[PDB]
Each structure stands twice: as C-alpha cells, then as structure tokens.
Symmetry: C6
Subunit: 71 residues, 6 copies
C-alpha cells in the first residue's frame, strides 16, 4: 500500500506527491536499484533530462491538483 | 477482452492500470514479442527512455484518475 | 466517412479507436503508402519511437474516454 | 479571418480542423513558404517526426472535441 | 501588465494569444535578445523544432479555449 | 512552505507561478545549485531546450489557470 490516496493537505504536499508518482513509474519499470543509481549519475547532470523530468511531474501535478479541487 | 473497465478500487490500482495501458499500446503496434525483448534491453538502461516512459503513464493515470472521480 | 463518432461500446474499443486516431494523422500527412512502409521497418524496432507512439495514443485515449464518460 | 469557430459538424471535421490548427502554428512562426517546402522534404520521411506530428494534432483534437461536446 | 486576461474575442485571437504565451516563457528564461536572435536563425529552419513549437502553442490554445468556453 | 496556494490574482501572476512551479521540480531533483549553474549555461543557449522549457510551463499554466477558474 504505497498509493493510498491523491488527497493532499496542502498544494505543496501535492507537488511532492507528484514527484513521487513520477519516480514510482520508474522504479516499477526498472526495479534493479543498482542500475537506477548508475542512470542517476547520468541524468542528474543532463539539462534536457531535467527539463523532461519537470514535464512528467507537471502532468502528475495536474492530476493531483484536480484531485484536491485545487486546494 | 483485456480492457474491461477504467473503474479501479484504489489509486494504487489506478497507477498499475495506467502502466498496463501504457504497455498495451507498444504491444499492439509491435506484436513480435521477440524484438520487444531486444528493445527492453536498450530502454531499461536508458535514462531519457525511462522518463519518457513515466510521462506516458502520467498521461494515462490522468485519464483513469478522472474516470474514478479521483478516489 | 472514416470518423463517424468517438462513442465506443467498450473501453477496449476506445483504445483501438485511439490507436486508429493516431495512425490517421500519419496517413494524412504522408499518404504515400510506399514511404509509410519504409518508415515502419525503421520505427517498429526503435524503443524511443515505440514509447513515443504510446504517448500519442495516450493523448487520444484521454479524448475518447471522456467522449464515453469513461464507459 | 482563418479560425472562425471551433464548432464542427462531425468528429471527422474535428480531426481535419485539429490538423489545420497544428499547421497554422508552423505557418505563423515560419512564414517563408519556401523553407517550409525544404523541411517538408525532411520530416515527411522522418518517423519520429511523423509521430511527433500526430501528437500535436492529438492535443488539438482534444481541445476541439471538448469544444463540440464530443459529438 | 503584459497578461491582463485570457478572455479573447474570437477563437482566432486565442491562437495568437497562445503563440504569445509560448514566446513569453522563452523571453523570460532568456531575456538576452541578442541570443534569442541567434537561436531563431537556428530553429526557424529545424523541422523538429517547428513541430515542437506547434506542440507548445497546442497546450496553450487548450488553456485559452477553455478560458473562453470555446467561443 | 514554498507552495502555499494555486490561487493567483491575475493571469500574469498565474504565468509567473507556472514558471516557478516548473523550476522547483528541477530544484528538488537536482539540489546541487552549483551543477544547476553549469547546465543553465548549456540550455539557456539551446533552442530545443527553450521550447521544451516553454512546454513544461504550458502544462503548469494549464493547471493553475483551471485553479483560478480562468480569471
Ligand atoms: C502515431 C503513432 C502510431 C501508432 C499508434 C501506430 C500503430 C500501429 C499499429 C497498432 C499497427 C499494427 C501492427 C500489427 O498488428 O502488426 C501499425 C502498423 C503499421 N504502421 Fe504504425 N503506428 C503509428 C505511427 C506510424 C508511422 C509514423 C508510420 C510511418 C509513416 C507507420 C506505419 C505503419 C505501417 C506501414 C504498418 C503496417 C506494418 C506491417 O506491414 O506489419 N505507423 N501501426
Ligand atoms: C509505455 C511505456 C512503458 C511502460 C510504462 C513499461 C513498463 C514496464 C514494466 C512495469 C515492466 C515490468 C518490469 C519488471 O517487473 O522487472 C516492463 C517490462 C518489459 N517491457 Fe516495458 N514499458 C514500456 C515500454 C516498453 C517498450 C517500448 C518495450 C519494447 C518494445 C517494452 C518491453 C518490455 C519487455 C520485453 C519487458 C519484460 C522485461 C523482462 O523480461 O524483465 N516496454 N515494462
Ligand atoms: C515557444 C515556442 C515558440 C513559438 C510559438 C514562437 C513563435 C514565433 C512567431 C509566431 C514568430 C513571428 C515570425 C514572423 O512573423 O516572422 C517568432 C519570431 C521569433 N522568434 Fe519564436 N517562437 C517560439 C520559440 C522561440 C525561441 C525558443 C526563440 C529563441 C530564444 C525564439 C526567437 C524568435 C525570434 C528572435 C523571432 C523574430 C525573428 C525575426 O527576426 O523574424 N522563438 N516566433
Ligand atoms: C503540426 C504538425 C504538422 C501537421 C499535422 C502537418 C500536416 C500536413 C498535412 C496533412 C499535409 C498534406 C499532405 C498531402 O496532402 O500530401 C502537409 C503538407 C505539408 N507540410 Fe505539414 N504538417 C505539420 C508540420 C509541418 C512543418 C513543421 C512543416 C515545415 C515547415 C510543414 C510543411 C509542409 C509543406 C510545405 C506541405 C505541402 C507538401 C507537399 O507539397 O506535398 N508541415 N502537412
Ligand atoms: C520520472 C521523473 C523523475 C523525477 C521527478 C525524479 C525525481 C527525483 C528526486 C526529487 C530525487 C531526490 C534528489 C535529492 O533530494 O537528492 C531523485 C533522486 C534519485 N533519482 Fe530521480 N527522478 C526521476 C527519474 C529518475 C530515473 C529515470 C532514475 C533512474 C532509473 C532515477 C534515479 C534516481 C536515483 C538513484 C536518486 C537518488 C540519487 C542520490 O543518491 O542522491 N530518477 N529523483
Ligand atoms: C522547467 C523548465 C525551466 C524553466 C521554466 C526555467 C526558467 C527560468 C527563468 C525564468 C530564469 C530567470 C532568468 C533571468 O532572469 O535571466 C531561470 C534561470 C536559471 N535557471 Fe531555469 N528554468 C527551467 C529549467 C532549468 C534547468 C533544467 C536548470 C538546470 C539545472 C535551470 C537552472 C537555472 C539557473 C542556474 C538560473 C539562474 C541563471 C542566471 O544566473 O542568470 N533551469 N530559469
């Protein structure tokens, strides 16, 4: 039971839930934590990757903001 | 009959379905399970590929979440 | 008369309609079926392309799910 | 006056308008019809370009479809 | 006071507002007009860039169409 | 407490918040402000990077605009 609800007390908590939702898709499709570390070293310093990341969390934040009727 | 409903009990199973839906699209377009195996070996270790992947499911989760009235 | 309605009997039929809607954009912008075959040989085996494909059908499935009030 | 309304009789004409809308954006940004011809020759034979293209129209179709109350 | 409202008299005016909204994000993140000119010379003739542009304005047009209850 | 509310007085401040939200995502993922400086130097002069950037904020603006009932 990792995703109980989308209901979030503050908009802030929603954005962290949004970052969370983004990473869990990743952890599911690549559960090998050893390779998840090796790729981190790569994208953490890649501009386009980091923009692309914000893109994902943007989509999710849209879903959870609506879940909270925009707090 | 693989996609009976968008209704899901919890957000967790909303996210799992979102993931499945993401996958069935590639399965329909590229049915040769063998080549699917070849490319798995390429994207599972790609950073940009994994973030892209997270995005697709983020769009899908957005649909089902709405379909469940956000739990 | 290729696109009569977005109304779909089952969620499943909506996803196939979504895959359809994705390909018709392609067929319109590149009606030369000869080059559509040559490009198929290329993207059918490209991981990023295949993710990108799921992305498109994801957007469309969002539109048709809503059209069916999520079945 | 090129974009009078988003109202469209059928979904088919919804998709055609979606396509047009996609195109008018590139036409506005790059008005030199000649170079537009040069690049046409490059993307019409690009796979990733065609899928990208399908995506833009998928976003647009999403807007008008909503504007037509989904027919 | 550059962005007073999203309310637009005609759908057409909404698309121009959408193109506007797209460029202002750019002007904010890169206010040096000298480098904005140098990059223009580059993307104005890049197919994928020009598709990518239409993608942005597509998202925005979705937001402003809704703002106008689709005119 | 950095994200107190999505409510914004004007669309202008809607767009500014949208931009901020876009940035906080990269700040959370990559907190080492120093490397953030290094990559700034790379994307601020990239065309595809700037359009990508505009897209993220276009998604975000879509969320808050909805949260403000479009002003
Ligand atoms: C917009 C995203 C796209 C989606 C969702 C999509 C989906 C599909 C699907 C589901 C099939 C059937 C595969 C099978 O059952 O064997 C297919 C086949 C095919 N697609 Fe795509 N496609 C997309 C883009 C493209 C593009 C850009 C091209 C090239 C211009 C293309 C060319 C083809 C061709 C030629 C086939 C028939 C392949 C064969 O002979 O087996 N498609 N596509
Ligand atoms: C829409 C984006 C995609 C998502 C969300 C996704 C998700 C997943 C997940 C959750 C798994 C299970 C991983 C595990 O339990 O270790 C998986 C495995 C797999 N995927 Fe993807 N995938 C995507 C795209 C693709 C593509 C483009 C391909 C290649 C054609 C592909 C081929 C495979 C294969 C063959 C496996 C089984 C791998 C193994 O043997 O461990 N997937 N995927
Ligand atoms: C966000 C997506 C963008 C859109 C929708 C967009 C749209 C437009 C449009 C419609 C024009 C007017 C073209 C004309 O009438 O001649 C234009 C011009 C221009 N754009 Fe973009 N643009 C985008 C991104 C960018 C970026 C990333 C840059 C570089 C930082 C840029 C720099 C310029 C410049 C310098 C001009 C004036 C070009 C000239 O001197 O004719 N734009 N853009
Ligand atoms: C937003 C994504 C786009 C869509 C949906 C789109 C769609 C289309 C369609 C449906 C056609 C008619 C094809 C035919 O009847 O054979 C076409 C042709 C054309 N497009 Fe695109 N296009 C897009 C982007 C672009 C871009 C970026 C350029 C280059 C600046 C471009 C330049 C052209 C030109 C010059 C033609 C006429 C080609 C010919 O002479 O056959 N389009 N496009
Ligand atoms: C889906 C988009 C993603 C988002 C929003 C995201 C976000 C984050 C955030 C906020 C952190 C914490 C950073 C810190 O506080 O130091 C983090 C760390 C990390 N991420 Fe990502 N991430 C994404 C994709 C990925 C991918 C694709 C991978 C590789 C498979 C990955 C691997 C890691 C690892 C290993 C860490 C821990 C790094 C460390 O040891 O400091 N993430 N991520
Ligand atoms: C989500 C997309 C992004 C948006 C909307 C965005 C927006 C902005 C804006 C509006 C500024 C102020 C520019 C000025 O006043 O001259 C800025 C500056 C800056 N950005 Fe971004 N940014 C994005 C992504 C990133 C990324 C990926 C990085 C690198 C990790 C980054 C690092 C920086 C840094 C270090 C500055 C300060 C630059 C300076 O000293 O002038 N941003 N950004």
């Amino acid at each position: 039971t990792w995703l109980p609800t989308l209901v979030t007390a503050t908009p802030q908590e929603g954005f962290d839930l949004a970052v969370k939702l983004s990473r869990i898709a990743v952890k599911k499709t690549q559960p090998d934590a050893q390779v998840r570390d090796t790729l981190r070293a790569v994208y953490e310093k890649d501009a386009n990757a980091l923009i692309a990341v914000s893109a994902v969390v943007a989509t999710h934040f849209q879903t959870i903001a609506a879940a909270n009727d925009y707090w």
